[PDB]
Design an enzyme around this catalytic site. Structure first.
Site, PDB file in Angstrom:
ATOM      1  N   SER A  39       0.784  -1.210  -0.118  1.00  0.00           N
ATOM      2  CA  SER A  39      -0.120  -0.094   0.099  1.00  0.00           C
ATOM      3  C   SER A  39       0.661   1.203   0.013  1.00  0.00           C
ATOM      4  O   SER A  39       0.245   2.226  -0.207  1.00  0.00           O
ATOM      5  CB  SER A  39      -1.071   0.119   1.080  1.00  0.00           C
ATOM      6  N   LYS A 203       2.919   6.733   4.467  1.00  0.00           N
ATOM      7  CA  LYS A 203       2.201   5.850   4.032  1.00  0.00           C
ATOM      8  C   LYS A 203       2.530   4.424   4.121  1.00  0.00           C
ATOM      9  O   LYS A 203       3.776   4.105   3.848  1.00  0.00           O
ATOM     10  CB  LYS A 203       1.773   5.970   2.320  1.00  0.00           C
ATOM     11  N   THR A 204       2.008   3.706   4.894  1.00  0.00           N
ATOM     12  CA  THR A 204       2.265   2.281   5.185  1.00  0.00           C
ATOM     13  C   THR A 204       1.841   1.479   4.035  1.00  0.00           C
ATOM     14  O   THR A 204       1.024   1.705   3.311  1.00  0.00           O
ATOM     15  CB  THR A 204       1.516   1.976   6.539  1.00  0.00           C
ATOM     16  N   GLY A 205       2.456   0.069   4.324  1.00  0.00           N
ATOM     17  CA  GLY A 205       2.101  -0.858   3.255  1.00  0.00           C
ATOM     18  C   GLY A 205       1.994  -2.240   4.082  1.00  0.00           C
ATOM     19  O   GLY A 205       2.957  -2.262   4.854  1.00  0.00           O
TER      20      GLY A 205
END
Length: 258
Positions: A39, A203-205
């Site tokens: 993500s 922003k994480t993933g």
């Protein structure tokens, strides 16, 4: 003690690129290896939408109507708005701040799919990033697969030019920063590895093979910002995400750059 030491303890493969924007000094580990970005691409997606809105200023206002069969797994905002639809801007905010998966698909339907996000990456100097699939297939994170991958260095470079440079016009740059600073789902990753005085936009993933990522920009209260990209993936398909590895990598990177 070090990224190499952290990796040995946690198992798996850890990729870090941290850049001090005042001196250009870096903290690195496997910074030119490909990783499944999961993500974290949603930062690029939002940028690409914002860039399309520069020649078409009404794009952010357009209303997207979707149905129950458009919902994919992990859609905490879009699943509340099946009966009203959402604007493009609202989908951007949902995909960046809550990591909503259907919102990403709905945005990519509007702007020309995985290929459009990749082309946008090329347009800002990233010849590495490739987006090949849609949510949630882009999170399979298979060992040796190059689909839906980038390097920590390429993503750090993109963040620098998007957040701190002139890749977007000022109004759109400000909106991307607002969205990133508003991430609601990352408190145990980069945000856990900096003092509470530093400001973060990130922003994480997360994906299969215990893939655990976070990319962003760090603003310490009295020094120039640091761009930080952290990618981490594991050997076994059912491995568990390790938030603490990202926090720990963030502590090492911040100390190297102190």
């Amino acid at each position: 003690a070090s990224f190499a030491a952290l990796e040995r303890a946690a198992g798996g493969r850890l990729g870090v690129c941290a850049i001090d924007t005042a001196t250009g000094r870096r903290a690195l580990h496997r910074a030119d290896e490909r990783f499944p970005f999961c993500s974290t691409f949603k930062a690029m997606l939002g940028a690409a939408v914002l860039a399309q809105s520069v020649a078409h200023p009404g794009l952010l206002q357009q209303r997207v109507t979707y149905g129950r069969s458009d919902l994919v797994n992990y859609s905490p905002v879009t699943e509340r708005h099946v009966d009203t639809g959402m604007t493009v801007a609202e989908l951007c905010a949902a995909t960046i701040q809550y990591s909503d998966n259907t919102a990403a698909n709905e945005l990519m339907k509007r702007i020309g799919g995985p290929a459009a996000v990749t082309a946008y990456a090329r347009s800002i100097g990233d010849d590495t990033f490739r987006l090949d699939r849609w949510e949630t297939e882009l999170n399979t994170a298979l060992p040796g697969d190059l689909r839906d991958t980038t390097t920590p260095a390429a993503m750090a470079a993109n963040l620098r030019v998007l957040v701190l440079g002139d890749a977007l016009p000022p109004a759109q740059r400000a909106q991307l920063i607002e969205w990133l600073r508003g991430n609601k789902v990352g408190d145990k990753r980069i945000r856990a590895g900096v003092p509470t005085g530093w400001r973060v936009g990130d922003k994480t993933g997360t994906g299969d093979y215990g893939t655990t990522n976070d990319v962003g920009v760090l603003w310490p209260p009295s020094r120039a910002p640091i761009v930080l990209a952290v990618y981490y993936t594991q050997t076994r398909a059912d491995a568990k995400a390790k938030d603490d590895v990202i926090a720990a990598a963030t502590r090492i990177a911040s100390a190297t750059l102190a």
